[PDB]
Write a protein that binds this ligand. Sequence first.
Ligand SMILES: [Mg+2]
Ligand code: NI
Length: 383
Amino acid sequence: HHHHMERVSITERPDWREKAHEYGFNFHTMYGEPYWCEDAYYKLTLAQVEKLEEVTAELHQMCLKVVEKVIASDELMTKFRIPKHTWSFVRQSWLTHQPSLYSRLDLAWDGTGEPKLLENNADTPTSLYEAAFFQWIWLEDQLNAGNLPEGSDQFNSLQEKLIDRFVELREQYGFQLLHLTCCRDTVEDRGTIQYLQDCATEAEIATEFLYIDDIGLGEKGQFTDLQDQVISNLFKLYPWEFMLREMFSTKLEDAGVRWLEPAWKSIISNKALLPLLWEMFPNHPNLLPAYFAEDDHPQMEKYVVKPIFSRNVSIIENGKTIGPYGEEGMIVQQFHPLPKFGDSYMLIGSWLVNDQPAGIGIREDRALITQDMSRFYPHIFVE
Ligand SMILES: [Mg+2]
Ligand code: NI
């Protein structure tokens, strides 16, 4: 398999599991978070990193164009499956310019051709802790042990940009006190929450963690915390796709809470994004053909049908029409295999902090069709 990036074997640091334990990083797979691996790393070039950076910034602007178009159209809000009882909540979040913290794009690329957008995890993207912090320490450690090329660098400014963004949220948007939440018995001990809380603390934001089921309902519709005090700003590791359909989700519109990620990110964190991107930016070098499966659309020789929702996938070929999952609620996307390095397919996770590209985290998986890649590998770039 010819690639312009290499997967380089390396001797694992002997104590990395305890390094994880000391930081409170549970590196085991859970809720789509990948298993940490470091018996190899990926090596990119400076040219490849500048290309990924360029493409990531532009795709994010393209996604912002999709939101404006969807927000304005009842028809498109329906096609994106935003529940009608939440349209006012979601639209007001966009029309008042509610701020974003982060996004992760998933890009298929081995350095040959153009990178292709497979999805924008713009709500609850996994592998933040590994990409921002753990692989940074890995780089410093393995440089010090003499196990990496002398000029090794890493496309990764996540921690710096996250702290700067929290400062910006505090100073210019009034995020003085930030609550953080997730569902009980999910990812509270993975590392992410504590890490983002540490970043917010460094930015001089006061923080409180509480589980989703800890949140109270006040007499005037306000959401309240473990001290029965009002929640004003709430970061969540729990997706809008679920919350907008949950019991008492009609209360969101009047709760007086500002959200990270904000409600309008629901529109770019599902697969309906991919057909709209292709319609608004036809033959864009970094997009793949995509259509709603229910629409009349060109026939593709080999393609993949994915549910609009993030809750598995099937492949079709030889110009056939649509399958166990059917047509309804599905999109279709031109089949485009991931690069194969040995026994595993590789996927590039490319991060944004608000609208600024902030680096990459690489994942692998032995299956072609997978919602969340099973394994994470650190990377470097040279030259
Ligand atoms: Mg109102
Ligand atoms: Ni320990």
